[PDB]
């Protein structure tokens, strides 16, 4: 009866796989088979931005590589000085279940979001003294996994509704909705030029999104379990998936397929957060068994371990300058490394 | 020393913020956070209503504040979230005493399997479930005054032969007590199967009009605190 549609869909998939197969003329190990390894990476917590009560999910640097916002499950956005340990601001959140946080690239705003399905826009550099909300973005029907600022005007949220969204702050309403995924989306990453982005979901398949009209540009499908974190490679022509099946993987958009998987037998905990540094020769992967790992993204062998956290690592972000990595973690301690 | 006049005033501001944070910690440490799970068949709304009387359109999570003996409980009834739960459940690894609710008179194996999953989940270990078996009275009329038998959906209910009950409420006919204890025992077995010592599972036979549910959590709940203290005071 209706099975023609399902059969031809599965055939479109069976041809997509072979189209992808006909492209890998060499593996990313092979092109980096001849390259110099990175060595061993040792990093020490220069600062330790302690002061959060409960665990930490969210941590975004300000775009000055100095300011740091962190979201905690007691409901605090604490904006740190991160050269001193000074606490620039402390915002009392409403829904203490924040999962993400942001920092507008100007720096004038932070958006926290959370499990209340609402992306809140707190305003720092008001002509007045204290921080207070600018808008509240309520159109998602499921918790927010991530949120990123396009600018002072546009914010992109990833929700548990299998949907990513685009917002206009003053109009406080969606401009576009991205609706391809099948499991709930867990992490979002704007492109380096903010023209497009990629969303890693709980379908074991992240998808690139072109935020001008709202069409899923392409769809990579390689992970065994659901994907916990995404982060664009700084050139914009790749990105990193750290999934709950204890693997990191690197996809690149133009070759449209998996390139290299960062794996090792001992890891049975999944990923929670990934990030490249500045040059993309180093992929920091945050893990779940209480300590991060540092991955030579090209040659894929582990190179450098961070282990200073009692509890699991939940957020991890390099600076735009590349001279620090904060690692918030469920032990409620941020840690700046170098 | 090596820092300017503004750096001094800035460390002053940061210390002021530390002071506010420690006031908040004084507030936040002395409060108890309960995640309230359960299914749409469960009396999940009725437990919340009862303890609310004891004390926003697409909101992801609701919450009721309530206190029992000068102790502030903060119970989060998860709201308009999706059917899957394996990712937002991790946000309650630090709560005290997940309340779990099932419908005794019921399709119950789904609740059984879900609580079995809650028991074994990483980050959900070290959290001691509290069981509230609702529709206890509805189970009374479903067993003593009804047709459908628990023998199917549960073959090993004919060969059960109830253990020596301490003192069931005397209004209960023995068949009712036997089945009622059967349900509790199925839940407890999978509670004791994998969670060695640090989980506890606290069963309870709760109803729509059982006004002791607030206290029933205080007690149990107070006893979870005591287990945590025994361990983290090196006293255990």
């Amino acid at each position: 009866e209706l099975d023609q549609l399902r059969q031809e869909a599965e055939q479109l998939k069976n041809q997509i796989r072979d189209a992808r197969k006909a492209c890998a003329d060499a593996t990313l190990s092979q092109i980096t088979n001849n390259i110099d390894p990175v060595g061993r990476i040792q990093m020490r917590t220069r600062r330790t931005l302690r002061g959060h009560l409960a665990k930490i999910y969210a941590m975004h640097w300000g775009t000055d590589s100095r300011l740091l916002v962190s979201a905690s499950q007691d409901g605090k956005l604490i904006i740190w000085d991160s050269y001193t340990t000074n606490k620039v601001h402390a915002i009392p959140l409403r829904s203490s279940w924040v999962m993400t946080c942001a920092y507008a690239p100007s720096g004038n705003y932070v958006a926290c979001g959370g499990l209340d399905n609402i992306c809140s826009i707190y305003n720092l550099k008001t002509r007045e003294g204290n921080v207070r909300v600018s808008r509240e973005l309520a159109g998602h029907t499921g918790y927010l996994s991530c949120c990123r600022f396009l600018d002072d005007n546009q914010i992109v949220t990833s929700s548990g509704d299998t949907t990513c969204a685009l917002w206009d702050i003053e109009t406080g309403q969606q401009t576009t909705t991205f609706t391809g995924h099948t499991g709930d989306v867990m992490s979002l990453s704007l492109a380096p030029d903010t023209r497009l982005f990629v969303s890693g979901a709980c379908d074991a398949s992240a998808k690139l999104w072109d935020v001008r009209e709202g069409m899923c540009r392409q769809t990579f499908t390689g992970h065994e379990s659901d994907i916990n974190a995404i982060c664009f490679f700084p050139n914009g022509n790749a990105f990193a998936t750290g999934s709950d099946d204890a693997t990191c993987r690197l996809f690149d958009l133009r070759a449209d397929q998996e390139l290299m998987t960062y794996s090792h037998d001992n890891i049975i905990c999944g990923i929670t957060s990934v990030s490249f540094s500045k040059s993309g020769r180093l992929l920091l992967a945050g893990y779940d068994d209480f300590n991060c790992n540092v991955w030579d993204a090209l040659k894929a062998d582990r190179a450098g371990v961070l282990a200073g956290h009692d509890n699991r690592v939940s957020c991890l972000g390099v600076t735009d300058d590349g001279m620090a990595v904060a690692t918030g973690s469920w032990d409620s301690f941020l840690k700046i490394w170098n | 020393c090596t820092l300017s006049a503004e750096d001094k005033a800035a460390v002053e501001r940061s210390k002021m913020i530390e002071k506010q944070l420690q006031k908040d910690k004084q507030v936040y440490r002395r409060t108890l956070r309960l995640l309230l799970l359960g299914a749409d068949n469960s009396g999940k709304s009725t437990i919340v209503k009862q303890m609310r009387i004891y004390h926003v359109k697409t909101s992801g999570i609701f919450e009721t504040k309530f206190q029992v003996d000068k102790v502030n409980f903060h119970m989060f009834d998860v709201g308009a979230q999706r059917d899957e739960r394996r990712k937002w459940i991790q946000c309650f690894n630090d709560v005290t005493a997940i309340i779990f609710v099932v419908d005794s008179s019921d399709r119950l194996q789904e609740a059984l399997n879900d609580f079995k999953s809650i028991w074994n989940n990483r980050w959900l270990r070290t959290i001691s479930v509290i069981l509230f078996l609702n529709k206890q009275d509805l189970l009374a009329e479903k067993v003593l005054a009804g047709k459908s038998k628990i023998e199917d959906y549960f073959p090993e209910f004919a060969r059960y032969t109830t253990p020596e009950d301490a003192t069931p409420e005397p209004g209960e006919d023995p068949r009712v007590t036997r089945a009622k204890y059967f349900i509790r025992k199925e839940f407890v077995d999978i509670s004791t199967a994998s969670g060695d010592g640090r989980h506890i599972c606290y069963p309870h036979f709760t109803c729509s009009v059982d006004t002791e549910n607030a206290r029933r959590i205080f007690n149990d709940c107070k006893d979870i605190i005591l287990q945590m203290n025994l361990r983290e005071y090196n006293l255990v």
Partner: nanobody, 128 residues
Framework: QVQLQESGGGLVQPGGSLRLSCAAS????????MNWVRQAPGKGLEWVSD????????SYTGSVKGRFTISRDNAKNTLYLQMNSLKPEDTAVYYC?????????????????????RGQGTQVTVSS
């Protein structure tokens, strides 16, 4: 992509013997404590069996106790459920499921309306 074809399903009489194969691919078969779940007309999804990582542990729902046997030979990347003593009450479509998280001993919402690690489906019928 995570993919789960399966075979089986037929017109077997109410008391017949039908075996349901299930073919997994794309994910390492053995680390995932898979299930057997099913959708009967007029109702919602339910749950049947809980074959463990290695085949060590097996559970059941009551109504199918003493009737169904579950094997998962990692050599073939296959999961199985053969059926004995059918009644015309368990006549549902069969959905060969999987854990979200590997190396773990619990399944979350395998009976989800929108789970993403299921099979397409196998339908079984009886009485004729």
């Amino acid at each position: 992509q995570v993919q789960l074809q399966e075979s089986g399903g037929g017109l077997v009489q109410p008391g017949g013997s039908l075996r349901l194969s299930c073919a997994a691919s794309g994910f390492t078969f053995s680390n995932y404590k898979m299930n057997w779940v099913r959708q009967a007309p007029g109702k919602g999804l339910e749950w049947v069996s809980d074959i463990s990582q290695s085949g060590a542990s097996i559970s059941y729902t009551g109504s199918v106790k003493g009737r169904f046997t579950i094997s998962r030979d990692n050599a073939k990347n296959t999961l199985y459920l053969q059926m004995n003593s059918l009644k015309p009450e368990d006549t549902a479509v069969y959905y060969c499921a999987r854990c979200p998280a590997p190396f773990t001993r619990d399944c979350f919402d395998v009976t989800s309306t929108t789970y993403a690690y299921r099979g397409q489906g196998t339908q079984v019928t009886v009485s004729s």
